[PDB]
Amino acid sequence: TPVAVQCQEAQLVVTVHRDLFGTGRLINAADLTLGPAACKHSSLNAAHNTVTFAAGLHECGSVVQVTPDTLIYRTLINYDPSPASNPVIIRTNPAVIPIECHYPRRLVFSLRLMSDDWSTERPFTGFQLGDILNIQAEVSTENHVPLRLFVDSCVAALSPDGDSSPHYAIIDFNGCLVDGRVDDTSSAFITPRPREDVLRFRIDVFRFAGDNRNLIYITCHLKVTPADQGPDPQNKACSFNKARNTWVPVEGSRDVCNCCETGNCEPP
Amino acid sequence: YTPVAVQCQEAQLVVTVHRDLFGTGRLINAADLTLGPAACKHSSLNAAHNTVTFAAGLHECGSVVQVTPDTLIYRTLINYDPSPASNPVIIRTNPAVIPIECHYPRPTWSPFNERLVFSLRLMSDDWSTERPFTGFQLGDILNIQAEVSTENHVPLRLFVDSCVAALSPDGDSSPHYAIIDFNGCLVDGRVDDTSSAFITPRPREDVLRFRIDVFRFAGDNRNLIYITCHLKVTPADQGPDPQNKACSFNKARNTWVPVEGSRDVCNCCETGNCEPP
Amino acid sequence: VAADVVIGPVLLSA
Amino acid sequence: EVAADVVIGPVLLSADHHHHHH
Numbered sequence A: 001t002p003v004a005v006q007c008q009e010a011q012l013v014v015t016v017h018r019d020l021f022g023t024g025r026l027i028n029a030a031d032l033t034l035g036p037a038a039c040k041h042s043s044l045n046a047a048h049n050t051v052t053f054a055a056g057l058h059e060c061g062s063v064v065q066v067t068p069d070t071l072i073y074r075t076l077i078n079y080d081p082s083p084a085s086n087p088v089i090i091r092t093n094p095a096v097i098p099i100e101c102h103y104p105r106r107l108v109f110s111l112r113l114m115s116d117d118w119s120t121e122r123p124f125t126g127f128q129l130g131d132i133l134n135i136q137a138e139v140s141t142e143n144h145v146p147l148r149l150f151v152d153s154c155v156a157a158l159s160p161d162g163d164s165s166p167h168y169a170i171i172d173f174n175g176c177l178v179d180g181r182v183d184d185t186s187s188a189f190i191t192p193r194p195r196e197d198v199l200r201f202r203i204d205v206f207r208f209a210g211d212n213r214n215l216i217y218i219t220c221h222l223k224v225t226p227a228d229q230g231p232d233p234q235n236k237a238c239s240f241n242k243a244r245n246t247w248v249p250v251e252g253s254r255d256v257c258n259c260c261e262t263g264n265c266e267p268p
Numbered sequence B: 001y002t003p004v005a006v007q008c009q010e011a012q013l014v015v016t017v018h019r020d021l022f023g024t025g026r027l028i029n030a031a032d033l034t035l036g037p038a039a040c041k042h043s044s045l046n047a048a049h050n051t052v053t054f055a056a057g058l059h060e061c062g063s064v065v066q067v068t069p070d071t072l073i074y075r076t077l078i079n080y081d082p083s084p085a086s087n088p089v090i091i092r093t094n095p096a097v098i099p100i101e102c103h104y105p106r107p108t109w110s111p112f113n114e115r116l117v118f119s120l121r122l123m124s125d126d127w128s129t130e131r132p133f134t135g136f137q138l139g140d141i142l143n144i145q146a147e148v149s150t151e152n153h154v155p156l157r158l159f160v161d162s163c164v165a166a167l168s169p170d171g172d173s174s175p176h177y178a179i180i181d182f183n184g185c186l187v188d189g190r191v192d193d194t195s196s197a198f199i200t201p202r203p204r205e206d207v208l209r210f211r212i213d214v215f216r217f218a219g220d221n222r223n224l225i226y227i228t229c230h231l232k233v234t235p236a237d238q239g240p241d242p243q244n245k246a247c248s249f250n251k252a253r254n255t256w257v258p259v260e261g262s263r264d265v266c267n268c269c270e271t272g273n274c275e276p277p
Numbered sequence C: 001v002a003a004d005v006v007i008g009p010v011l012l013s014a
Numbered sequence D: 001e002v003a004a005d006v007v008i009g010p011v012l013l014s015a016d017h018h019h020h021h022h
């Protein structure tokens, strides 16, 4: 391959061949960056036409997933060609190369991207518009009492910072899946839950206008209450159903979702 | 099952499209479908099986005609342009384009004093035959053959004064990009890493071949191009001059090179002005 | 008690 | 000046804006 990744103790070192597409045509070093933060290269090797990136495991907008036995750090190499002689045309396409580092591990919340049958976890690549993201939120089964898990908000963006522009709220107002309210989406929480401390939901795939990297990050605010406690306008998981024109909670009284339509579920 | 049905009638075409175009379950909105680069609206719809119909004269809505020796070919397309999402920062559905084609059976003189027919053909790599207008990728090369009908007239030499790429048959629209300019300078070959050039020698003086590296327009999610060229003829044995020539930039030699004529007829290509006094 | 958790990058292909 | 404007197309490209050589 044209990309070599060294997963070291507390950094990763990525070496990229400037002959990135095996055509023999060399890309510009300055057109390659690391992570959604677009960090610049740390060194070049002219003799071998390579470009090297070195970053701490938490730097440059990397994302960590904590599994029972493993820590997985995911990032990417961005190739963004400099302008053609006349910028209205493109002679060379951009590209994104996913980078991953796995480490044995030495309340914990987690989000996992599941296959459509929810049997297994699936790759983060190979989505096309028309596809559905199946997201499973969960919270570790620590000794402590039985819990119920909610997702207060999820925001999509072009980097792990959901406050950056552009961004798009998928879940808002303390558990209202607002993406399901509009257009022709089928986005919704799944019912019933597998367990009270697991919450599943599906989102129609989308992408951000004007973004030529064609990727998204989703950042969610997860929280728990005691398992037994009644859902209320502050703690709930509601979906909109266009057919019936109504909000519907995963559990609890129908009217707990009323605030979803008004766009404010804070209690004053 | 025929997702797109085309009736090629005497002086119009009628195109019928199933709104279950993509088989995603979801029917598309009739208003999201239009005909031709002009985006003409549908002429009728039918709820029985959710179809949408377009009817237009053969020359309407930005269609393009090719005149071959024995056939007339009219080419257009059906546009699918999903309405924007409620929040415009995101896109859930890509636009699509469906190509549409209709085929129809179709004392010497001097134009410098009984009509010339000019034509551009997209050719296979080996120039043996004509090839499909689909399946192009960046990296690929367009082999374009310009020609002018040869029936019972004086011998002619053919030039291409300019070619402009754009998103519709109107080369004056934005965006557009001049591939050939300044009266026959293949300026696309002057820049970046292209190998675009006129071919030498010509097969006949009244044919001119050239190769253009494929490119696409920034921001265009339909993924198409139209190329419109201004072709002209002179008497065959007339000497090329700065206003009548076919010049390529040869990167290896770092100079302009005419298909025929003296080397210095291409000088004005570098300066960007081949207009006379 | 709560946490922010990020998932991605999700890469779209065509 | 004997001449004409001739249009060629539509030339349809791939929908993959990340397409590259193997």
Ligand SMILES: *[C@H]1O[C@H](CO)[C@H](O)[C@H](O)[C@H]1NC(C)=O
Pocket: B107, B108, B109, B110, B152, B153, B154, B155
């Ligand atoms: C017309 O073309 C023929 C064949 O090329 C001869 O050149 C002929 O002398 C021409 N006649 C006129 C009147 O131009």
